[PDB]
Symmetry: D2
């Protein structure tokens, strides 16, 4: 048992933190105010290494493990206020780069993977539908096999990066049943006939991270664009969620570390009744809760990633981490606001915007109720 | 013991609800989107009766008790999405109209009170300072007595309605000590030399309800503009907070009643896994919490107002109501968002904006930690 | 709307409180220490009126409504430390006296009801089985119709008062289906051939309130011992639970009122660090929670009972009250213990025994998860 | 970073677990029922190694680090139902053996330490007084220096093991001020003139772990019985609490691991409504909370002990662990009871007794409010 980072891991974290502070956080307030996702800045961050993860050197990646990748993303979360951009970049990595690397043919990787790893192409992951969110195997988009490939029809919604993506990793039914083997994955390029990408739909949470719906009207998918085997898509989707749920969630751990530091500084500096407000137990009790949450969920995250790196079954640990991080991030957001009082209603300081940005952490990649269904199944309660 | 409204009270509630739906809620989405406070619409609502409260018929009021006034404001909260406007109107009523009615001289009431009651003049309440929020008796603005009145200097912050107000109810020190008798209240008109009203400072919560800072640079206050006796201001401020804390908080009870209805409708209609999502206990358990909260805090509010109407000491009951309503409003906001999942990130439906609008309820008129200090004192724990 | 008791209700409460303090609470510590249920003392309390409730004067009752009955039981809970005895007496009233009064034939009432009302006979309610607790319609005891009545077989468990009861109100299947109409109710006397009443089974919660299992080995039930019509038993059981869940739960409201007074007195008197421990916000924040809980659940209880008295549908209100009272009673038990620190480990003061006595409130008459299923159904979430 | 135990640590844990199951847990139910602390069995466990900890081989110890010692005690907590005995043995180790080893003179260690390490003498730690619990530096017992040593007077309360102890580690004032340097520690033998050990005072929590008060009436303490330097006692007390708070708290982590296994087995086996009760989300959501708590507080405990072993400052980490473990142990106790329903009221299964045994974990060695004061001070909020 050892609770230190390796020297390599300390360097990865500190380098990522410096990049997030010195490059991404510069001029963040203007981009946030204007709801701008700068794709030039996104591509710099991708190329710096935030789009690399476990990808091999052959395709321009860094062969990072899960703990290394989570540490990099934790630094990003602590160092940059522009969490919309960071969420966009990490969704591309965890839900698009990594599945293509893990399941795509040599031909598909040779054509697209280095471009996705190095900041040349942006990808979006398209699985959720109007009638298939938590119940993702109810998806109704169909990739009907035909001569030469598939005919694709359907509608996908809530698709992060769709308005800016060059390629789409799309999940659709290649068989009528709701089984583990009815879903397949495909890579489709922007501009393919019949791919209709909707306009950006604004939101108040992660408000500069673009999403939209996409509609497939009789798209022809060439056989060679299928990712993995026929029917693998349920398993490919599942695997990609595991990566997203652990590593991507590290963003909110780093965000909580930044929030706690900001909150402690204010509670020491702001005086009422002749003393720092942190001297009143109502105030310090909440801040202590924020610190307890941060230490607990960080350790759970690190252990989940470490278990994956060891080749152990980490499915329940990752679901537990996802759940704790997101619940703790939202509640600590509210606790920080309450520490600042009326001063929390300053848009520049951004405490309310920070809370808005944490609200979706309990929803993306599977809600926290679905995390508990996963844990319940692993505990043997769904027999 | 009786838990029915009177017929008079049912009529007051239903008339207020119809006005909020048929007048104020029309075109609310455009005003919300554009961050517009329509003063023409505000004045219609004031004149309809939302600026009347307990004021006598002599000054154009309706002689409502606290329970009647709270019921009217509950209807406003349920019926209109434009809670920024409603908060603006109720702050004018509870913190400006009512103290002037209760403490001002016949001369001051004759000059200003009917105008404030009937939608002709807008008022702002100015007590909080940079170094005096919870510790309001630390306020440093000084009204130094002189020949003919007072010389006023100081700075007030977080002042609801200041950018649109015609008159300001201002609290300042007329004596150096932090005692119950060091503070006095004054009415000052917009345009008085030395009154410098700051520009609107935007916020994400209650985002169309304007606030700003105001600065006093050697304002001369004529003696006849003092509200109540010299030193009454601590007691006048306290009394106005009691009215604000009970009646004004009813807005968030009505808002919770609307939110619960919206949430129940969705949980019955949205299906996943072959059934309505309300059939899963994770989902229904949260909605039941929202319903438990609504019923409990509504009863506590009604009893607090009823006690006031009976002439009983309601101070602790009002602090308890303020605390429960605001905590429950925020947590139910988060519960509704979690019920809708990704669909909660629709700006038109407004579930995230609703949460933003509830966040300040735990802060205005005294934070919830200060409510617990008040209750602790009434329980004998501050002896 | 009115939050005062009537003069009649104030007298009922104060008379019950005096009886609980001056008769039942005397020598309670010895009976508690020795795990004694004094049936002589029980019968005095029954005859005083705690076994009367809504029963008509014809059978020696007081024709109390639900709110009156709940107030009497609240006083009992506040005034007597011997909550095991009080629970025993209220179970007899709410689950045995009242169903017999509401559903039994003139012949059955004439034979047994005045004796049960006036402290002459003790009754036990026997519905729960090893395979039928929350799922009460799965009960497997069978009352097979035959010439002259029924042949009864089965086993009932968790039966309050069975070791001391003279008569048993028993629920059993008269038809094979799990429907609303498969269950019937019967009154059976102690000593009937084939009625095998088990020995008292000790417990640490409500430890002097006796319970045991009972077994039916081919009991012959005469036709005239059926309570209500054939198949009414599901509805009779349901109705009796409504009475038990509202009125009987008042015991724990009165117990919380006593606990809060004890806790406030200690927090004012116990000094550390040069002041009363109630002056520290960690301490006063918990006590304030106890007070918030007490006021909220008392109002919910009173409204539920008042709605019943008005002839309105009170089913959801009663389930909400049951849930709030019991959750609040347990958590306030823990909060009081934490206020006293090591001093809470005094058996005479009884703070730990009080917590033990509250633990079963979340279980009897339907667990709190079943209360939420009931509320969910009334909210339309079980369609 | 590594989350595996070493092979040595796995052996320590498994050996301790086997001893707790195969020796201490045998016949535990009889001892629990009879409120028996078997000193013969206690001494076997001490000699097995539970009284060794970090003590050197010179005095018969095992030179364990904090993580090793915490693992041994975690196994004890999981393997033996007789947590009263385990608490007694661990209090002797952490608050008496370890301070004597760390601070006592060669002469005092040579005379007493091997006997305490090996199961020959039992010790009690006596610091708390009627007016000095959380405010331990208010203690009023005085050790007035005189020719040859000290004259001791005072009263100590809540003293674990006092009715069975052969020696007492006693803290008293050697100087009038409440400073870090006013308190000294002394070892006093049973039977010393003027040492009046009270009779066992029963309690419902940890009910077979004996405690009592002790009174000093003009005891003469020889100079050579002082432990450490004059005035070290504040620092010796503090150090002993650090050991007690981390390692001793591991008992409740192991107890939670056992409780969760018992609870999962029941939730899989008990059926209602045609399925295992674990299939209902109200039920599985609570069990998942128990599992989340166990994993989080175990990791926090291990890291606190590891930090100590690394020579790092672990004071805040230990206070956080103490707080989380004890809060989680109590709440999981209530969650297990609610999972079992009426079946939790079985004394043999012991779910209610388990809860009683966890209640004091939030109080011993400093309440959880004092843990938050410690963390607040380490966070810089008490400047
Ligand atoms: C910021 C963000 C980015 C996203 N990016 C993408 C993307 O890039 N690609 C993509 O394909 N999708 C994306 N999604 C969609 C996300 O996958 C869905 O929002 C998620 O699967 C939940 O589905 P839903 O929103 O339809 O909620 P629903 O499934 O309708 O859930 C509604 C409520 O019902 C509860 N519920 C549903 N089923 C159960 C059950 N069995 N048991 C208990 N409770 C249940 C839910 O927990 C929730 O409380 C994104 C979502 C967000 C918030
Ligand atoms: C929507 C809104 C509208 C407002 N409108 C007006 C207006 O119209 N006129 C006007 O004069 N003011 C107005 N205010 C200001 C409001 O009165 C102050 O925000 C409030 O008094 C709290 O003061 P503060 O913001 O400086 O917080 P602070 O007092 O700095 O509180 C910061 C934190 O310290 C805690 N704290 C402070 N003292 C204690 C203590 N003794 N014990 C425990 N905790 C403590 C607080 O609870 C809070 O968590 C408005 C505020 C809001 C949010
Ligand atoms: C003090 C006390 C006195 C009692 N007196 C009597 C008496 O006099 N007469 C009599 O007949 N009975 C009596 N009972 C029994 C009581 O009725 C049962 O304990 C109660 O019905 C719960 O059943 P159970 O204990 O078998 O729990 P179970 O039904 O086994 O419940 C176990 C767990 O599963 C949960 N669960 C079960 N079904 C669901 C579901 N659909 N959804 C979500 N969660 C679920 C439960 O909430 C609980 O958490 C008494 C019980 C107590 C504690
Ligand atoms: C099982 C058990 C075994 C024990 N064994 C020993 C032993 O062997 N030797 C020995 O010397 N002692 C022993 N103790 C005593 C223990 O040290 C004291 O119980 C503990 O120090 C708390 O003191 P107290 O009980 O007087 O509570 P108090 O100090 O009176 O606390 C009462 C309440 O006030 C709160 N409070 C007090 N001060 C503050 C503050 N500044 N800020 C916020 N809240 C505050 C407390 O948190 C608590 O909620 C034992 C206690 C227990 C439960
Ligand atoms: Cl405090
Ligand atoms: Cl469910």
């Amino acid at each position: 048992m050892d609770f230190n980072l390796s020297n390599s891991q300390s360097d990865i974290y500190e380098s990522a933190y410096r990049f997030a502070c010195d490059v991404l956080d510069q001029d963040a307030q203007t981009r946030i105010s204007q709801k701008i996702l700068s794709t030039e800045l996104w591509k710099k961050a991708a190329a710096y290494g935030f789009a690399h993860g476990p990808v091999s050197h052959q395709f321009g990646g860094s062969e990072l493990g899960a703990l290394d990748t989570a540490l990099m993303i934790e630094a990003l979360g602590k160092g940059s206020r522009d969490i919309g951009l960071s969420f966009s970049l990490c969704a591309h990595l965890c839900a698009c780069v990594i599945p293509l690397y893990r399941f795509g043919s040599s031909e598909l990787k040779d054509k697209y993977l280095e471009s996705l790893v190095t900041g040349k192409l942006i990808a979006a992951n398209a699985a959720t539908e109007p009638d298939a969110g938590s119940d993702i195997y109810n998806m109704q988009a169909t990739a009907q096999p035909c001569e030469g490939g598939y005919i694709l029809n359907g509608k996908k919604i809530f698709i992060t990066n769709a308005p800016i993506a060059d390629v789409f990793i799309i999940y659709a039914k290649t068989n009528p049943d709701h089984g583990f083997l009815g879903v397949s994955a495909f890579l489709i390029e922007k501009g393919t006939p019949g791919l209709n990408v909707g306009e950006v739909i604004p939101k108040d949470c992660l408000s500069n991270c673009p999403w939209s719906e996409i509609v497939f009207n009789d798209i022809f998918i060439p056989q060679s664009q299928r990712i993995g085997m026929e029917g693998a898509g349920g398993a490919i989707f599942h695997d990609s969620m595991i990566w997203e749920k652990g590593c991507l969630s590290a963003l909110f751990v780093g965000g909580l570390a930044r929030l706690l530091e900001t909150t402690l500084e204010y509670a020491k500096a702001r005086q009422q009744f002749g003393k720092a407000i942190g001297q009143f137990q109502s105030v310090s009790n909440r801040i202590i809760d924020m610190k307890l949450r941060l230490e607990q969920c960080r350790l759970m995250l690190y252990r989940a990633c470490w278990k994956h790196d060891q080749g152990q079954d980490a499915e329940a640990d990752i679901a537990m981490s996802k759940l704790l991080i997101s619940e703790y991030a939202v509640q600590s957001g509210l606790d920080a606001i309450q520490t600042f009082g009326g001063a929390a209603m300053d848009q520049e300081l951004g405490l309310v915007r920070h809370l808005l940005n944490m609200i979706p952490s309990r929803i993306f990649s599977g809600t926290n109720d679905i995390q508990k269904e996963i844990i319940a199944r692993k505990l043997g309660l769904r027999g």
